[PDB]
Amino acid sequence: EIPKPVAPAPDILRCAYAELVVTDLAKSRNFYVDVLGLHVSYEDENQIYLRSFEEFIHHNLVLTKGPVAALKAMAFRVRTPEDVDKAEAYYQELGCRTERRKDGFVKGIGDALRVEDPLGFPYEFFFETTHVERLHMRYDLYSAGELVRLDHFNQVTPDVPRGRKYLEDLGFRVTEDIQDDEGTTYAAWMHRKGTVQDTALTGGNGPRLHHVAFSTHEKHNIIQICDKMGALRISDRIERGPGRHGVSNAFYLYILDPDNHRIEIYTQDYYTGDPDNPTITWNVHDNQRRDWWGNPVVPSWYTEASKVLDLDGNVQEIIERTDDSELEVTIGADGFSFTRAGDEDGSYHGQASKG
Amino acid sequence: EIPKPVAPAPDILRCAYAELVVTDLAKSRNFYVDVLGLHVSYEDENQIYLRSFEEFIHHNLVLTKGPVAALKAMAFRVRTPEDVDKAEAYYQELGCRTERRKDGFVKGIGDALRVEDPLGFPYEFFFETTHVERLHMRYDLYSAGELVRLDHFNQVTPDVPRGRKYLEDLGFRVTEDIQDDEGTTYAAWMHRKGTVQDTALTGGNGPRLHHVAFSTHEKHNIIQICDKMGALRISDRIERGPGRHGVSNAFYLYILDPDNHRIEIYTQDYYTGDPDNPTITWNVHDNQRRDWWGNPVVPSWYTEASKVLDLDGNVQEIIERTDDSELEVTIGADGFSFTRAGDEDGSYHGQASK
Amino acid sequence: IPKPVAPAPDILRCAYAELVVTDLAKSRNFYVDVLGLHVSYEDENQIYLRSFEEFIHHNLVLTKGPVAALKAMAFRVRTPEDVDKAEAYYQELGCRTERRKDGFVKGIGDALRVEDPLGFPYEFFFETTHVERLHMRYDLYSAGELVRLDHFNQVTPDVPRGRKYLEDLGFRVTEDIQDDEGTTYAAWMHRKGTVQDTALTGGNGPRLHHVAFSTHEKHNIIQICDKMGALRISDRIERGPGRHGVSNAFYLYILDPDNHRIEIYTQDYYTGDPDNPTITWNVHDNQRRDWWGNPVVPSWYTEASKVLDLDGNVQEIIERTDDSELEVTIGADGFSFTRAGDEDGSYHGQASKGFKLG
Amino acid sequence: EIPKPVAPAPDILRCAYAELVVTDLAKSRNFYVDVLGLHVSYEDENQIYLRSFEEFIHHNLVLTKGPVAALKAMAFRVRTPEDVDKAEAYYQELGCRTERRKDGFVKGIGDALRVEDPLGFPYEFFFETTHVERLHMRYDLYSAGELVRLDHFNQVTPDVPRGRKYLEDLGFRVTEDIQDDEGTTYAAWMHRKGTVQDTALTGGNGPRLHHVAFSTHEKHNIIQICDKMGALRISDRIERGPGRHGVSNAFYLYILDPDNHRIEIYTQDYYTGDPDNPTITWNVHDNQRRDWWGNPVVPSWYTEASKVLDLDGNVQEIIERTDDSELEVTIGADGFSFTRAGDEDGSYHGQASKGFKLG
Ligand SMILES: O=[N+]([O-])c1ccc(O)c(O)c1
Ligand SMILES: [Ca+2]
Ligand SMILES: [Cl-]
Ligand SMILES: [Cl-]
Ligand SMILES: [Cl-]
Ligand SMILES: [Fe+2]
Ligand SMILES: [Fe+2]
Ligand SMILES: [Fe+2]
Ligand SMILES: [Fe+2]
C-alpha cells in the first residue's frame, strides 16, 4: 500500500498534455496533422507541438523524436505556481524520484516538476504555460473529424486497487470501475476536471500507457475519422470501434499511430464535479460494460500498450499482473460474458460476442 | 437461363412493403412499434400494419401471425393499374404460378398480383393502395431513432448472374456488385427508384430473405437504435454494425427481430437515376467492400436468413449454391482479404480482420 | 402556352447551371475555398465545378463576362434522341433554339439551348464526360460538403402559366402556395423523385432566384454558417438556417460575389410515385416558408439574378400583376398566423418575431 | 461598490436548480414534460419537480403554483455542508436578508439557505439533496430533443460592473463580456463548474430573470425542439434562434414557457476550468457577438424578462438601468453594428441586420 503523505496534495486542474517519443517524426506528423487535423503550435527537426481546436495552453501533445517509441511524460496542470512546490514536497515524501526545472522540459511550459511516480509513470505537474491563439471559433480551419480537446490518459498497471488509493490521496475521484464477485478489480476511472476521467487504470502488465484520448464535438466527427481512414486505405489502423462505451457512456474509437501508440477519440460523457457523484461499478462479465452494444473487444486492446520512460529516458521495467486477466475471464478459452445477468440466452462461453 | 418474355415488363416504381409471418404477434409488436417506433396503420389480433415516418401509402410492413416465421410477400408498387395486368402476363409467360386478387391480399392494398417468381420468391405487384396521413412533418411523433422510409429488400439466391439477368429484364439496373478475378459473382445490387437498390442478391442457399431495410435521416438516428437496444438489454440482437458500407456508401446497422428476421437500418447512399450511372465492381477479397472501416463480417450474416413461402403458405425448398462462397474465400480457413491490394500488411489469411 | 403535339423530351433531373460572373478569382474563392466544390476544369475564362457525389462533368460553370446573370439552366435527358425531341418540342412552341452537336460548355456533348416561353435559357443534353465520382473520397470531405445539385428556382410573374407549361414538359407539382381568393404565389415541381428540380417564385421576371445544393446532414449546413462567421462574411448569409414548411428540407441561403443566391438544402422526401400527394399552403401561414416561424427577409422576395438570352443579352423584365407575397405577409398591410384563425401568434403589418421591414 | 467580506466565500460547485412560480400548473407541465421531455421526480397539485437526462440530484427545476409568475429561487450547490454556514456568514456580512431551513424549502433538498442578494436576487445555497436514478444511459427514454443537463442562469441587472465584482468575490470567474469603447459593460458571463457560465448578467432594468438554460448533446437535438414546436403549431413560442453564439460559441435556442419564462437550449461551449482562462471581450457593435451568423437579436430579448421574488414571496421592485442600452446602441434609431471592424460594407445604421427594423 502507498502511504498517504502528511504533506498536502497539489491542486490538480486536469490532464494537459502528453509527450510521446516517436521514431519517424515525418510519419508521425502525417498521422497527427494530415490524417487527424491537430494544430501545430511549434515544430522543428526534433519535435512537433500540437494542440486541439479549443485549447489555449501551448500544446496538448508533444511528439519528440527518439530511438524507442514510448511515453516520456503525462502532464497535469495545477491551479497555482505554489502547487508545483506542493507536488514536489508530496512526491519527495512518497520517496519518489523528482526533477524540477524552472524553465520547463518542453517549449511552452515554464516551471515544471517531473516525477517517477509510485506506479512507475512519468508524471509532470506545471502551472506556467505560454498562451496561444484559442482556435475554438476558427471554423475556417475546422475539419469534419476535428479533435476539440484533450480528454484523458489511460495507464496499464498490474495492481489496480494499489494505484487507485494513491490517486485518490492525490485528489482524483473514482467515477466508474470494473470488478468481479471474487474481490478483483480490473479497471478504474478517476477525475479532477468534472468529466468521467483525467486518467484511468487498466489492469495489466505495467507500467505501460494504454492510450491518450481526444474529444470531438459530435458523434459524426468520430464517424468521419473512420471514413477518412477507409479513404486513405489505412483502415487496418482502426483497432476497435466506433462504439458506445458502457463505462463513461461516451461514443468512442481507438486507432493506432505509426509507432502503435493508441489514440482514443471520445465524446459526450457526463458531469462528475459534485463530490458525492455516484460511483458506478460494472461486473467484468457484463458484455455491455466496454461496448454498450455488445461488440467484442479485440484481444490486442487488452494485450498491447506503449512503453513508458523514467526521468533518464530509459524504458521502465514491466511488472507482471498476477490478478486475473480481463481478457482471459471474458474472451479466453475459459471466459464468460452475459448480455442479461442470469440469462443463458445472449451469453458467451469461451469466446467473444457476435460469432 | 430465364428467358425474357415477349410480354412487356410491368413498370415498377419501388419496393413498397413486405409481409412477414411472425410466431408471437405481441412480441413482434414490441420490437417493431415499441423498440423501433414504426407507425400503426391498422391492427387486429392477427396482423399489424406499419409504416415509416415519410410514407403516404397504407403500409411498409405487415406482420401476420402464423405457425412458421417466413417472408410471405415482398411487394413492389407499379406505375399504373394496367401494370398489374402486364405483371400477370409477364409471369404467366415465364411459366410461374400466379394469383390475382382484385381486392388485394392485405388491407390497404387493392388489385394485386402475387407470383412464385423464377428464383422461388413470393413477389407482389400492385398499384392501388389506401393513402394515409403522411407523417413527414409530425415531429411531435418523431423518435430519436426514427425510421423514415422503406429502402430495399435483400434476397439470398444461389446463382447471382441468373437472378441478375432476370431482374434486369424486369427493368432493375445494377448499381454495384462483388466479383473475383476468376469471374464468380458473389452479390449484386439493383434499382428502380434512383437509389442504390430496391432489391439485392446475395449469393447463397435460397430462396431465403436476407433482410428488409429501412432508412433514417441521419447517422445519429442509427446510433440511437444501438443505444436503445443496449438500454433495453437486447444488445445480443445487434448482429452487425453500425458501420459504413463500401458497396452503396451507406451508414448501416443489422438487427434481428423476435423470429430472427433481419432488419437493416440504412442512410445516405447516392443517386443512381441517370441511365448510364457508373456501375461499381468490388473484389471479394477487398476488406473495405462490406464494411469500409474493415470491421469483420460475422459468419451468421453470411449463413442465416429467413425462409420464404409459396402461394399456399408453405415453405419453399432451398437450392444450395454451387458457386464459391464469399464466407469461405474471405474469412474461412482457406480465405483471405486485404486492406491494400498486393500488400501483406493489413491482410488476413484463414482469419477475419481485427 | 399550348401543349405541343410533339412529344416532350424525357427529362431526368436538373444537371448544371452556367452563371456569368464578373471576377473569376473572387467567384473561385467563394465556390472552391469557402464552399468546397470540386474543380473539373478551369482556365482564365471559366471554372467548372461539381459536387461530392457527381459523376457527370460538372454541376456549375462559372463563365467570366461583363454582366452577372444566369446564362443557362441545364437539364439532363434520358437518351440522345430526347435532345431531338426537345428541339422539335420548343420549335412547335415557337421558341428560339440553338443546337450545338459538340456542346456549349466543356464536358457536354450534343446540346440544345432554348429561350423558353417564360424567357429562361434552358439547356437539354444527354452526352457528358464522366469524371471520378468522389462520393467515398473522405480524405477530401469538408465539414460543409456539398454532395449534390438539387434544384433551380425561377422568378416569374404568372405562376399558373408557368406551372402549366412545366407540367406539359413532364414536371409534376409537389407543393404550392396559394391564398383563399385563388392567387398562386409559388409552385415546386420535379422529375427525379425529390420535391423539386425547378420551382417557380411569383415576382417580376424572368430572373433566377437560386441554385440549390444538398448536404448529407443538417450539421453540414450549420458548418457553412459557422465558417462564414469565421471568415467575417456573415453579411453574405441572407436567410436561415431553417426548416422549410414547403419541402420539409433544412435550408440556408447565401450570396455569391455577384449576388447570385445559393441555397443549401437537405432531407426533403420521396415524390416518385405518380399519385404523390400534393400539398398546398396558405400564403398567410407563417410556418409555410420557415417552419419555425422565423421571418422571411425582404431581399428574398425582391432580389434575384438577371437571365440572358441566346445572344448573351439580358432578358427584359415583366412585372407581376398578381398580389405580392411580401406585401400580403410582412408589409404594412400584410398578415400571417401561427394557427389558422387564432389572433394569438398572429402578425399584422410586420414580420414575425418583433421585426418590421427595414 | 459591494465590499469583499472578511468572511470566506462558500465553495460553489455549480448552478443546480431554479424554482419558478407558474400560474397554471397543468399548462406548465404540458410545456416542460410533454413538449420538452423533462423527467418528473415528484409532483402534486401544487408543484412539479423536474430533472434533466443526466442528473442525479433530485431536480433541476421546480414549478410552483402561485398567483404571480416569477423566479422564486436560483439555487447553487455548494461543496460541503459547512459551505452553507459559510454562505450564511458571507451574506450576513454583506447586509443581506437570509433565511435558513434545516429541512429545505422544496422537496428533495435538505439544509438550505436562501438570501436576498445585493442585486435583489433570491439565491439558494445547499449541499444536501436526495439522489435519484441517474438516467444518463436510459436510451429507452431518450427524446429526439433530450435536455441532458442544467447549464446556467442569466440575470437582468442595471449595473453590470457592480454585479460582476460581487460575483467575482464569490468565486465566479468571468469568461466573456460585452463592452464598448466608452467604458460601458452590457453583459458578462461567469462560472464555477468549468463551462462558460453558471450565471450571467445582462444589462437592463432589474432584478429580473432573463432565462434558465438546459443543454443537449448535439446540435440536431436543438433543431428537433424547433421542428417539434412547429408540428405542435406553437412556433410563436420560439423567441429567437436557433443560432451559434459569438459569446460562449454555443449553439442555442430561446423559447417561452406559458408564463413567458424564457428557456435557453444550449450545446457545445468550451472548457474554462483553468484559473487564467482567457477572458474574451466583444465590442457591443460587433454584429457577430450574440449571433455569430449575424442574425438580428429580437427586441423582446432585450426588453422582456421575469419578475423575481423576495423571501416573503413578494415581487422585487425594479430599478431602472441608467447605463446605455444594448438594444438602443445596436438596433435602435441611433444604433450601429458592423460585420468587419472599420468596414462600412456590411454595417448597419439605425436598424437591425438582414433587412429588418424594430417593430
Ligand atoms: O456492403 N454490404 O455488406 C452491403 C451494402 C449495402 C447493403 O444494403 C447491404 O445489405 C450490404
Ligand atoms: Ca462608442
Ligand atoms: Cl472500454
Ligand atoms: Cl422558403
Ligand atoms: Cl446572445
Ligand atoms: Fe479511454
Ligand atoms: Fe442491405
Ligand atoms: Fe429552393
Ligand atoms: Fe444564456
Side-chain angles (χ1 to χ4, degrees), chain A residues 5-25:
Chain A
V6 174
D11 185 355
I12 298 154
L13 298 166
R14 56 159 172 148
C15 68
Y17 82 88
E19 180 179 12
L20 295 178
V21 179
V22 302
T23 56
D24 181 329
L25 196 64

PDB file of all heavy atoms in Angstrom, chain A residues 5-25:
ATOM      1  N   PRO A   5       0.726  10.856   2.235  1.00  0.00           N
ATOM      2  CA  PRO A   5       1.664  11.815   2.809  1.00  0.00           C
ATOM      3  C   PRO A   5       1.016  12.728   3.843  1.00  0.00           C
ATOM      4  O   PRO A   5      -0.190  13.000   3.798  1.00  0.00           O
ATOM      5  CB  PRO A   5       2.137  12.622   1.591  1.00  0.00           C
ATOM      6  CG  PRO A   5       1.975  11.681   0.452  1.00  0.00           C
ATOM      7  CD  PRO A   5       0.696  10.952   0.764  1.00  0.00           C
ATOM      8  N   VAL A   6       1.818  13.189   4.787  1.00  0.00           N
ATOM      9  CA  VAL A   6       1.406  14.307   5.623  1.00  0.00           C
ATOM     10  C   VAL A   6       1.309  15.583   4.779  1.00  0.00           C
ATOM     11  O   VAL A   6       0.368  16.358   4.922  1.00  0.00           O
ATOM     12  CB  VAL A   6       2.368  14.472   6.810  1.00  0.00           C
ATOM     13  CG1 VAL A   6       2.043  15.729   7.626  1.00  0.00           C
ATOM     14  CG2 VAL A   6       2.285  13.224   7.684  1.00  0.00           C
ATOM     15  N   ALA A   7       2.270  15.769   3.886  1.00  0.00           N
ATOM     16  CA  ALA A   7       2.291  16.938   3.013  1.00  0.00           C
ATOM     17  C   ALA A   7       1.031  17.039   2.143  1.00  0.00           C
ATOM     18  O   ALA A   7       0.538  16.015   1.653  1.00  0.00           O
ATOM     19  CB  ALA A   7       3.547  16.910   2.151  1.00  0.00           C
ATOM     20  N   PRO A   8       0.495  18.266   1.973  1.00  0.00           N
ATOM     21  CA  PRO A   8      -0.750  18.433   1.220  1.00  0.00           C
ATOM     22  C   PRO A   8      -0.571  18.093  -0.257  1.00  0.00           C
ATOM     23  O   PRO A   8       0.460  18.408  -0.859  1.00  0.00           O
ATOM     24  CB  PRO A   8      -1.089  19.920   1.389  1.00  0.00           C
ATOM     25  CG  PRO A   8       0.217  20.576   1.703  1.00  0.00           C
ATOM     26  CD  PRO A   8       1.027  19.555   2.449  1.00  0.00           C
ATOM     27  N   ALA A   9      -1.570  17.444  -0.838  1.00  0.00           N
ATOM     28  CA  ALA A   9      -1.539  17.191  -2.268  1.00  0.00           C
ATOM     29  C   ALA A   9      -1.631  18.515  -3.050  1.00  0.00           C
ATOM     30  O   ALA A   9      -2.318  19.462  -2.646  1.00  0.00           O
ATOM     31  CB  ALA A   9      -2.653  16.242  -2.670  1.00  0.00           C
ATOM     32  N   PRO A  10      -0.956  18.565  -4.189  1.00  0.00           N
ATOM     33  CA  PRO A  10      -1.191  19.696  -5.094  1.00  0.00           C
ATOM     34  C   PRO A  10      -2.609  19.699  -5.628  1.00  0.00           C
ATOM     35  O   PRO A  10      -3.218  18.628  -5.734  1.00  0.00           O
ATOM     36  CB  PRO A  10      -0.193  19.448  -6.220  1.00  0.00           C
ATOM     37  CG  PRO A  10      -0.035  17.966  -6.233  1.00  0.00           C
ATOM     38  CD  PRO A  10      -0.055  17.568  -4.788  1.00  0.00           C
ATOM     39  N   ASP A  11      -3.114  20.893  -5.938  1.00  0.00           N
ATOM     40  CA  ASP A  11      -4.432  21.080  -6.547  1.00  0.00           C
ATOM     41  C   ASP A  11      -4.307  20.893  -8.057  1.00  0.00           C
ATOM     42  O   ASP A  11      -3.871  21.804  -8.768  1.00  0.00           O
ATOM     43  CB  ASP A  11      -4.981  22.469  -6.192  1.00  0.00           C
ATOM     44  CG  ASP A  11      -6.387  22.697  -6.695  1.00  0.00           C
ATOM     45  OD1 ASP A  11      -6.914  21.824  -7.404  1.00  0.00           O
ATOM     46  OD2 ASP A  11      -6.984  23.746  -6.371  1.00  0.00           O
ATOM     47  N   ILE A  12      -4.661  19.700  -8.536  1.00  0.00           N
ATOM     48  CA  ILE A  12      -4.575  19.376  -9.967  1.00  0.00           C
ATOM     49  C   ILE A  12      -5.863  19.814 -10.695  1.00  0.00           C
ATOM     50  O   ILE A  12      -6.981  19.484 -10.257  1.00  0.00           O
ATOM     51  CB  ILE A  12      -4.333  17.863 -10.192  1.00  0.00           C
ATOM     52  CG1 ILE A  12      -2.999  17.458  -9.557  1.00  0.00           C
ATOM     53  CG2 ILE A  12      -4.416  17.487 -11.679  1.00  0.00           C
ATOM     54  CD1 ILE A  12      -2.963  15.998  -9.175  1.00  0.00           C
ATOM     55  N   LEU A  13      -5.704  20.558 -11.792  1.00  0.00           N
ATOM     56  CA  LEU A  13      -6.849  21.036 -12.596  1.00  0.00           C
ATOM     57  C   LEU A  13      -7.399  19.965 -13.538  1.00  0.00           C
ATOM     58  O   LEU A  13      -8.616  19.767 -13.612  1.00  0.00           O
ATOM     59  CB  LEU A  13      -6.439  22.244 -13.435  1.00  0.00           C
ATOM     60  CG  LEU A  13      -5.993  23.487 -12.656  1.00  0.00           C
ATOM     61  CD1 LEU A  13      -5.304  24.455 -13.624  1.00  0.00           C
ATOM     62  CD2 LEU A  13      -7.160  24.106 -11.900  1.00  0.00           C
ATOM     63  N   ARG A  14      -6.497  19.299 -14.248  1.00  0.00           N
ATOM     64  CA  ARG A  14      -6.872  18.493 -15.419  1.00  0.00           C
ATOM     65  C   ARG A  14      -5.634  17.857 -16.014  1.00  0.00           C
ATOM     66  O   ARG A  14      -4.514  18.360 -15.820  1.00  0.00           O
ATOM     67  CB  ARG A  14      -7.558  19.340 -16.511  1.00  0.00           C
ATOM     68  CG  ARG A  14      -6.731  20.537 -16.997  1.00  0.00           C
ATOM     69  CD  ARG A  14      -7.209  20.986 -18.374  1.00  0.00           C
ATOM     70  NE  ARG A  14      -6.609  22.225 -18.832  1.00  0.00           N
ATOM     71  CZ  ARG A  14      -6.361  22.522 -20.112  1.00  0.00           C
ATOM     72  NH1 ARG A  14      -6.629  21.654 -21.087  1.00  0.00           N
ATOM     73  NH2 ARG A  14      -5.867  23.716 -20.439  1.00  0.00           N
ATOM     74  N   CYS A  15      -5.829  16.800 -16.801  1.00  0.00           N
ATOM     75  CA  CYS A  15      -4.826  16.419 -17.781  1.00  0.00           C
ATOM     76  C   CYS A  15      -4.595  17.565 -18.780  1.00  0.00           C
ATOM     77  O   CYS A  15      -5.505  18.293 -19.129  1.00  0.00           O
ATOM     78  CB  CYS A  15      -5.195  15.138 -18.501  1.00  0.00           C
ATOM     79  SG  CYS A  15      -6.621  15.260 -19.582  1.00  0.00           S
ATOM     80  N   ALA A  16      -3.342  17.768 -19.157  1.00  0.00           N
ATOM     81  CA  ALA A  16      -2.983  18.914 -20.011  1.00  0.00           C
ATOM     82  C   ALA A  16      -2.277  18.541 -21.327  1.00  0.00           C
ATOM     83  O   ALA A  16      -2.587  19.097 -22.385  1.00  0.00           O
ATOM     84  CB  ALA A  16      -2.152  19.911 -19.226  1.00  0.00           C
ATOM     85  N   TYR A  17      -1.286  17.662 -21.258  1.00  0.00           N
ATOM     86  CA  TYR A  17      -0.572  17.209 -22.448  1.00  0.00           C
ATOM     87  C   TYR A  17       0.189  15.926 -22.170  1.00  0.00           C
ATOM     88  O   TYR A  17       0.469  15.590 -21.017  1.00  0.00           O
ATOM     89  CB  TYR A  17       0.372  18.312 -23.007  1.00  0.00           C
ATOM     90  CG  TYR A  17       1.725  18.440 -22.319  1.00  0.00           C
ATOM     91  CD1 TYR A  17       2.815  17.696 -22.736  1.00  0.00           C
ATOM     92  CD2 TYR A  17       1.913  19.334 -21.272  1.00  0.00           C
ATOM     93  CE1 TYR A  17       4.066  17.817 -22.111  1.00  0.00           C
ATOM     94  CE2 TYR A  17       3.154  19.470 -20.642  1.00  0.00           C
ATOM     95  CZ  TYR A  17       4.227  18.693 -21.057  1.00  0.00           C
ATOM     96  OH  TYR A  17       5.458  18.807 -20.419  1.00  0.00           O
ATOM     97  N   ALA A  18       0.508  15.198 -23.244  1.00  0.00           N
ATOM     98  CA  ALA A  18       1.415  14.066 -23.174  1.00  0.00           C
ATOM     99  C   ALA A  18       2.613  14.362 -24.071  1.00  0.00           C
ATOM    100  O   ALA A  18       2.464  14.976 -25.132  1.00  0.00           O
ATOM    101  CB  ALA A  18       0.745  12.778 -23.601  1.00  0.00           C
ATOM    102  N   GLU A  19       3.790  13.925 -23.642  1.00  0.00           N
ATOM    103  CA  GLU A  19       4.959  13.856 -24.506  1.00  0.00           C
ATOM    104  C   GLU A  19       5.210  12.419 -24.902  1.00  0.00           C
ATOM    105  O   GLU A  19       5.466  11.538 -24.047  1.00  0.00           O
ATOM    106  CB  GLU A  19       6.198  14.440 -23.814  1.00  0.00           C
ATOM    107  CG  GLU A  19       7.422  14.372 -24.711  1.00  0.00           C
ATOM    108  CD  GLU A  19       8.683  14.950 -24.102  1.00  0.00           C
ATOM    109  OE1 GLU A  19       8.722  15.237 -22.873  1.00  0.00           O
ATOM    110  OE2 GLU A  19       9.648  15.122 -24.890  1.00  0.00           O
ATOM    111  N   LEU A  20       5.081  12.175 -26.193  1.00  0.00           N
ATOM    112  CA  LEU A  20       5.311  10.861 -26.779  1.00  0.00           C
ATOM    113  C   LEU A  20       6.589  10.870 -27.585  1.00  0.00           C
ATOM    114  O   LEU A  20       6.781  11.716 -28.449  1.00  0.00           O
ATOM    115  CB  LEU A  20       4.166  10.466 -27.714  1.00  0.00           C
ATOM    116  CG  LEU A  20       2.783  10.253 -27.080  1.00  0.00           C
ATOM    117  CD1 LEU A  20       1.770   9.906 -28.172  1.00  0.00           C
ATOM    118  CD2 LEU A  20       2.812   9.160 -26.022  1.00  0.00           C
ATOM    119  N   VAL A  21       7.454   9.912 -27.314  1.00  0.00           N
ATOM    120  CA  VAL A  21       8.606   9.680 -28.167  1.00  0.00           C
ATOM    121  C   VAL A  21       8.164   8.844 -29.355  1.00  0.00           C
ATOM    122  O   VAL A  21       7.458   7.834 -29.208  1.00  0.00           O
ATOM    123  CB  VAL A  21       9.758   8.988 -27.418  1.00  0.00           C
ATOM    124  CG1 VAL A  21      10.938   8.740 -28.350  1.00  0.00           C
ATOM    125  CG2 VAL A  21      10.188   9.841 -26.226  1.00  0.00           C
ATOM    126  N   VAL A  22       8.566   9.315 -30.537  1.00  0.00           N
ATOM    127  CA  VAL A  22       8.241   8.683 -31.802  1.00  0.00           C
ATOM    128  C   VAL A  22       9.526   8.445 -32.605  1.00  0.00           C
ATOM    129  O   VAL A  22      10.535   9.112 -32.389  1.00  0.00           O
ATOM    130  CB  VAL A  22       7.253   9.555 -32.635  1.00  0.00           C
ATOM    131  CG1 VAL A  22       5.965   9.805 -31.848  1.00  0.00           C
ATOM    132  CG2 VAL A  22       7.890  10.875 -33.061  1.00  0.00           C
ATOM    133  N   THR A  23       9.493   7.478 -33.519  1.00  0.00           N
ATOM    134  CA  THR A  23      10.710   7.088 -34.223  1.00  0.00           C
ATOM    135  C   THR A  23      10.928   7.812 -35.553  1.00  0.00           C
ATOM    136  O   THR A  23      12.060   7.996 -35.984  1.00  0.00           O
ATOM    137  CB  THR A  23      10.754   5.571 -34.505  1.00  0.00           C
ATOM    138  OG1 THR A  23       9.588   5.166 -35.224  1.00  0.00           O
ATOM    139  CG2 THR A  23      10.890   4.771 -33.192  1.00  0.00           C
ATOM    140  N   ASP A  24       9.848   8.210 -36.212  1.00  0.00           N
ATOM    141  CA  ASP A  24       9.959   8.886 -37.508  1.00  0.00           C
ATOM    142  C   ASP A  24       9.047  10.095 -37.452  1.00  0.00           C
ATOM    143  O   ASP A  24       7.819   9.974 -37.527  1.00  0.00           O
ATOM    144  CB  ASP A  24       9.596   7.900 -38.624  1.00  0.00           C
ATOM    145  CG  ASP A  24       9.692   8.505 -40.027  1.00  0.00           C
ATOM    146  OD1 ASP A  24       9.462   9.731 -40.186  1.00  0.00           O
ATOM    147  OD2 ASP A  24       9.963   7.736 -40.983  1.00  0.00           O
ATOM    148  N   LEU A  25       9.649  11.262 -37.266  1.00  0.00           N
ATOM    149  CA  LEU A  25       8.888  12.448 -36.957  1.00  0.00           C
ATOM    150  C   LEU A  25       7.956  12.773 -38.142  1.00  0.00           C
ATOM    151  O   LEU A  25       6.816  13.156 -37.930  1.00  0.00           O
ATOM    152  CB  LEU A  25       9.816  13.619 -36.616  1.00  0.00           C
ATOM    153  CG  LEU A  25       9.193  14.821 -35.905  1.00  0.00           C
ATOM    154  CD1 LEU A  25       8.674  14.433 -34.533  1.00  0.00           C
ATOM    155  CD2 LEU A  25      10.207  15.952 -35.792  1.00  0.00           C
TER     156      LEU A  25
END
